[PDB]
Write a protein that binds this ligand. Structure first.
Ligand SMILES: Nc1ncnc2c1ncn2[C@@H]1O[C@H](COP(=O)(O)O)[C@@H](O)[C@H]1O
Ligand SMILES: Nc1ncnc2c1ncn2[C@@H]1O[C@H](COP(=O)(O)O)[C@@H](O)[C@H]1O
Ligand SMILES: Nc1ncnc2c1ncn2[C@@H]1O[C@H](COP(=O)(O)O)[C@@H](O)[C@H]1O
Ligand SMILES: Nc1ncnc2c1ncn2[C@@H]1O[C@H](COP(=O)(O)O)[C@@H](O)[C@H]1O
Ligand SMILES: O=P(O)(O)OC[C@H]1O[C@H](O)[C@H](O)[C@@H](O)[C@@H]1O
Ligand SMILES: O=P(O)(O)OC[C@H]1O[C@H](O)[C@H](O)[C@@H](O)[C@@H]1O
Ligand SMILES: O=P(O)(O)OC[C@H]1O[C@H](O)[C@H](O)[C@@H](O)[C@@H]1O
Ligand SMILES: O=P(O)(O)OC[C@H]1O[C@H](O)[C@H](O)[C@@H](O)[C@@H]1O
Ligand SMILES: O=C([O-])C(=O)[O-]
Ligand SMILES: [Mg+2]
Ligand SMILES: [Mg+2]
Lengths: 471, 471, 471, 471
């Protein structure tokens, strides 16, 4: 079965009974809750349906809260949706209005004040493009230069305009709070522009008394300019290609994607590739050849996880989207799990030990690699190496199981907090022997550490035959 | 500037004024004429517009004739189009019919005789899928299992059914004849299933007294099963992903593509990657992130050429399709031109000499690599290596200039047939000095051969300073 | 310290008081007792002096018994010695006689029956050469082709001739018996030709009730033709270049040496390079440039041990020979310990684990690698890799400490027979902390295995800080 | 047949009749004349015998003049000799005297001023060692620490001591003058310490109106400290191990040898390995195993030439020394001609083109590589790569044929100075067809250059079939 992980975004199309359950059954490893949409009630209900389906099927499902950040947006249209055709004049106003085809609000109140004739305005990640002709008091008068359909509250991007807005708005802070309290496993922050942005997420987490891993979404040039610092200061990154493809030239995105994946794997941080991977399946039961390709090449790039957005959130074929993405990933993986090699020899204890664990298990044809982890680190350092062998993480902290749902190749087992490595090893046998997949005598390679229950104590590798007296 | 080549298909959207000329101006290196559509008059006119624009701009443009081959298709509907929705019952008949929503003819007259309940029918490369429920005399009664809009003469594919059809129908043979006579530079054959299929193309070519390079289109499992023999028996291959993605699981296409590109470059045969690379630009001014990716990864795969089909033939943004594809290719190339390495040391004289020419020019920081070729082979063996250096082919046969339009990184110069290699070298200087860009004293590396005017005589490398007396 | 080990041969020049002690003090790691010379008393007394000096200094010293084997020899001459001049006719007869200048016996009773006109006869490793002219009944009539002095019982070789003889003569068997009883740590067999020869050595070992490691001496073509089988059937090999260089053309020896060392390391068997490495120091206090080179290149070849023969057995500068050999080895090793890489990935548990242990220790800058071994195998698989880090073997079998004295880079510590791996690790700390060299908190990598006391149970790696609570 | 070249030293043992001719016939590629011994008449006669034998046999033989340089020496003793025994007190004085056991002169007049208590004094490359106890006015009072016989004018070395003396003495200047006039092909300078030393050799060469290649002998620490500068400023280097092994610790020489050979090959300068390679053949008909090894490992190190000194100059088996050295070199080469790879990609035209020429020839199984050279450079850049294929140099300057006799793998043909490259190629065929080895249709790769007869103009590679019309 599949090694590459699948993130799905929840929405209107997953709101009906036991759709969430079908998604998990079809392979969803992480549920994304997008805080740009929905009411708190909708997010509670969805969260609850994910815990039910995860617990009831036995499959790990991480819940990731996506914070809107400083996303600039349109207001409402009287019709909910209009066509912006090439040649038309449109006003985007910071004043209040009855929104119509000709005149629509925006949430960015400095827009009239900061826009300059010549500026370009991409709507909805480029389904429409406009050029600013003038600013008349509150209105930015523009010409539609590339036409297309626009609708309520779609995003706008103003490439190069250097936008003033908090890294976390009042709304983001409250959504973060509600999400921490509800119990989510990870938090993603939109529009990261600095490694220091994670500090602000941590400040809130600490007031509230609870931290989880933070994912930087990469969709700003400033973020790509600071890629390594951001990969080091955050716990994960998402290549957020929708907005990245209008914040930067769309032609630069594929190499940015590839670099950012490599940078994540170099430093053992999960990385998610997001947005329009199967875009056409919003309306169609099968994807284009470019989509299938895009997904396969994200696998070969070495991405831990691929994400579906509108394909599951508002689309007509959410389940098929998930199964399809799963089939393409598996097709690549049946061929090879190899990823671009790392450009350094590991230097950290946990990196050096995990690297060696992998060598041992592959050279002996072990049935599995097994690694004990309290924070996930030791397992992340092995996962990044890719390996055809099962990579089975063991932990006593259930949150780590949900967190590891976004890490390549990794299934997790929860066991009691043990006071010794012999104890860790007995638990391995006990857990695996209750599975079909393992029987007594099977060869496994186990990484563990003492002093027990201490992050970063990893210090042993143990070649072990299940149940046999080799400890 | 750009190395990877761009094929565009002509059609209704380019029959409008000055468009062919704009396509060439925007970068089209090969024009595809698809013999599944059009009147012979349409193809004459289009051919003519390509020669005008090529000659008037100075840019080489190969004209490639695409033969329909044994493509199975629907007949006509009595509105020209219908919607096939999920749940509906459709009859596909080999009899005579009123074509309508409920019942439509097919060109494959063995269909009732070859179909079995359970067979799948993918229409229009999978925008609709049906399952055969029964065969009643002439009619194949099916249920729509994935719905979508259908129209006149859309192609159908029947995975699992064994289709009987000639490699070349009598229509194909007449189209081939007309195309040879009109003067096209290359010929592509659809649905190749055997290395022996090229013999049948050659049989006709010889009756008529004129051969050109033949491209195998790869869109049948039998073709992938015989990939190496087909790459060796034909002069080039096109990864034809539209049909390949319904003739095989669509999830297997991206790895088939990667292997087929490698197999082409191993044996120095041009390879084209085709179909839905920028699919959404049929209706939109900008592509998805998957499309951009797909195009970039075809570059990194090492494809000589990428093709646009509906994006230029019937679409709304033909020019933007071409410029966009050009921008993404250039973006990848500005980073690196490197391609997957070859899995052998070259053994043929022309391969060994071309390989060394490349080494010399790069290690001396020469301004350009120049190779004399009569058949194109010598240049193809260098092109496959990729190299950041200009790769300038010289020939006395204009056909070879058009043919080399589909080969990576290659600009061609036509010069007189010379009777010595010194003469070949003076012609190099003459031709390059007619450029603004090139000046006396510049370092170039020139490959040539004697006895002169003999295919495969390639046997010299000469490091030469333009206009200096070093010969 | 030095890593490459030094074998020394005992003889007249080491018989005097406290010389054996000075040899050990200067670095002797193995003492060779050559059973071609001396009476049993001589070997008793020598063995005794080696145990005293080893035990009193704390340096491991293996004692190796070298068995003469089916060495072919001359008989006796009436005057004990004659000069054979170039041009003279000499008979070597299988008839019994007290010899003379014209006619001398040989111990090889099939000589007249097996020799053919044309054969060459090299005496005493080639200081005199004859050509066989004829065989007349019992006498092999020869012409002296290269002159020199001969004496009683000097060895003769007939390159290319097929010798029929047991692997062990009755003298060898009795010497083996006396050597086993006296307590030697290893046994070398001269003139091995077959992997089956070790069976006969084992048959005797078993009659007597004692086995030790057996070294095949490589000094016969048959042995080089069967190099892998012999390396696999024996426990070690010695490149015995003196006889090898007359049994084969002397010009073939250096490559044979290099191959045989590689084949030993590939299969984790110790290998000794023997004979004339410092030949001139028999008479001089400093060696030639060729000698120094020869020694350095034996190190770079990857030899576990280098041997001195006449340089310590009969020479005038035995101590200087040993220190000089030590200074050259150290000089090469101070530069780099790197060795020709192995031509396979290790596949045995002990090899895979030892290889990984090495990776871990070097990548974490461990102070030492430690491996527990019961037969030495696990340590031999690490030793062959070379590593600049101390490689400290731990064992409960003292004989293994003596045996490991011929294995590269390896210092051995004897500890109690332990009943658990925790127990193994506490012993490590205890032993190392009794050195000035090691302190609490020092980082080591320990290889061990359970069940305890089981050959090949090796299955754990443990990164451990001396005395800290990390077990 | 042999690729590695053999230098021999001439002396008393080759002054006997027809010996020089036998030496050349047995393989001598360069004759060394050592100007520390012999009178000018002796060197005239020897030079003459070499030209006769070279010209009469058709084998190239370079003549190398070895200049004594600022060698420090003892004066004369009353008896022509003394025995210096261990424990005794000896004075070496800078005063003039007919010496005795107690007190003998030295040619180094700053010795009392530059020696300090503790310094070592090694005589005759270390047959005797003394330690400086004190300096009293002119006398350096020492204790003999390693005893032996000394005689008139023996060389002494003072490891570490910082010596002031001109690079060339008055005697060296006159020997250089006589050697230039007599017609030698190259000159070696002893005890080079600086890149600037070659300037003073050039100053004399220019006064006299004749330059030849200069070899730096490497036998001083200062020379190893400046190894690159010296390799670049001189035309060749000799690893002069006799003095190098007393000027430095003898144990450091093997690594110095290896890196000096590497540094020569990196910069395309010939390198000679000298002294005691076959030392014991001075007295014996067959060498030790260490010697054979030393010779083989000089080949594997990548040395262009190996040198015999006393083995041919004063020894009893000069011919056997030469044949034996030839047999060992061939034995290594039959195995592989490989040399340690270069640590850079070549950057000079001649290096890049020679490197490519070799690729082409090996990949096509060309019968030979042929390179035209006016100074030898182009051929030296190919020779350093080693190649199993014949490397045939073509030149119009006969002195270059003698000079190339010390470059690896290279046989030279003299031809007319031609005024075109076509003319160069016809000459190739004509010359080679007169050999047994070549026939019409044989495949060769020819390097040449225009303008013709201009050093460094190398700029063409031509694959050519002998006698065929392919130019
Ligand atoms: N069930 C468990 N019992 C004891 N220790 C555990 C358990 N799970 C994880 N650990 C500890 O977590 C460490 C690995 O944590 P980390 O460095 O974050 O990968 C190991 O060295 C273990 O000591
Ligand atoms: N303009 C020309 N005049 C004469 N011969 C040419 C010319 N251009 C190319 N060639 C020949 O074409 C050969 C390479 O052909 P091919 O093997 O088909 O690439 C060269 O070696 C030349 O011998
Ligand atoms: N001191 C010891 N006490 C008990 N067993 C030991 C000891 N030292 C080594 N061994 C065992 O010998 C194994 C390695 O032996 P071998 O495979 O022959 O190298 C280790 O895994 C240990 O189980
Ligand atoms: N017989 C010759 N006639 C003309 N040029 C020659 C001849 N022999 C050698 N050369 C030249 O030697 C040059 C290379 O010399 P070098 O730079 O020393 O390798 C080439 O460019 C040739 O032109
Ligand atoms: O591969 P490694 O040597 O374990 O490096 C991994 C790197 O990223 C980690 O996540 C840590 O933040 C760095 O300290 C470490 O250098
Ligand atoms: O050896 P190369 O020059 O790379 O050519 C590789 C292969 O390609 C060509 O198309 C030939 O048909 C093959 O026979 C040849 O071996
Ligand atoms: O896989 P390795 O650790 O290198 O072991 C390599 C070989 O050497 C040992 O001596 C065994 O007898 C062989 O069975 C084994 O194949
Ligand atoms: O680039 P290559 O041909 O290998 O040359 C490497 C070096 O060798 C020569 O001897 C030159 O003195 C250097 O200037 C040159 O850089
Ligand atoms: O000068 C030499 O050749 C030496 O010292 O070896
Ligand atoms: Mg975004
Ligand atoms: Mg010297």
């Amino acid at each position: 079965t599949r090694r590459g992980k699948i993130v799905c975004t929840l929405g209107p199309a997953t709101q009906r009974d036991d759709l969430v359950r079908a998604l998990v059954e079809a392979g969803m490893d992480v549920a994304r809750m997008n805080f740009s949409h929905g009411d708190y009630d909708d997010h509670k209900v969805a969260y609850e349906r994910v815990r039910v389906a995860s617990d009831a099927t036995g499959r790990a499902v991480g819940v990731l809260a996506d914070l809107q950040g400083p996303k600039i947006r349109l207001g409402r249209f009287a019709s909910g949706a209009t066509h912006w055709a090439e040649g038309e004049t449109v006003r985007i106003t910071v004043g209040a209005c009855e929104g119509s085809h000709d005149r629509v609000s925006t949430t960015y109140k400095r827009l009239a004040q900061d826009a300059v004739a010549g500026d370009r305005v991409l709507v909805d990640d480029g389904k429409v493009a406009l050029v600013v002709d003038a600013v008349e008091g509150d209105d930015v008068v523009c010409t539609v230069v590339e036409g297309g359909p626009v609708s309520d509250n779609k995003g706008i991007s103003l490439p190069g305009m250097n936008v003033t807005a908090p890294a976390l708005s009042e709304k983001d802070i409250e959504d973060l709070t509600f999400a921490l309290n509800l119990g989510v496993d990870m938090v993603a922050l939109s529009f990261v522009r600095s490694p220091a942005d994670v500090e602000l997420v941590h400040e809130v987490m600490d007031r509230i008394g609870r931290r989880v891993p933070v994912i930087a979404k990469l969709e700003k040039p400033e973020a790509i300019d600071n890629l390594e610092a951001i990969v080091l200061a955050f716990d994960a990154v998402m290549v957020a290609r929708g907005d990245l493809g209008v914040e930067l030239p769309l032609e630069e995105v594929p190499l940015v994607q590839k670099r950012a994946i490599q940078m994540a794997r170099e430093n053992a941080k999960p990385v998610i590739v997001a947005t329009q991977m199967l875009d056409s399946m919003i309306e169609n039961s099968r994807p284009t050849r470019a989509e299938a390709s895009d997904v396969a090449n994200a696998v070969l790039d070495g991405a831990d996880a691929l994400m579906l957005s509108g394909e599951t959130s508002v689309g007509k074929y959410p389940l098929a989207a998930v199964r399809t993405m799963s089939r393409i990933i598996c097709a690549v993986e049946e061929n090879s799990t190899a990823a671009p090699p790392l450009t350094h020899i590991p230097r950290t204890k946990r990196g050096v030990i995990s690297y060696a664990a992998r060598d041992i298990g592959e050279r002996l044809d072990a049935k599995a690699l097994v690694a004990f982890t309290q924070s996930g680190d030791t397992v992340r350092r092995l996962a990044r190496l890719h390996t055809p062998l099962p990579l089975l993480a063991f932990t006593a902290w259930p949150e780590v199981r949900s967190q590891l749902a976004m890490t390549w190749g990794t299934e997790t087992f929860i066991v009691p907090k043990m006071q010794s490595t012999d104890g860790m090893i007995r638990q391995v046998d006990k857990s695996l022997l209750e599975l079909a997949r393992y029987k007594r005598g099977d060869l496994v390679v186990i990484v563990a550490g003492a002093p027990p229950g201490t992050v970063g104590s990893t210090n042993l590798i143990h070649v072990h035959r299940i149940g046999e007296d080799d400890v």
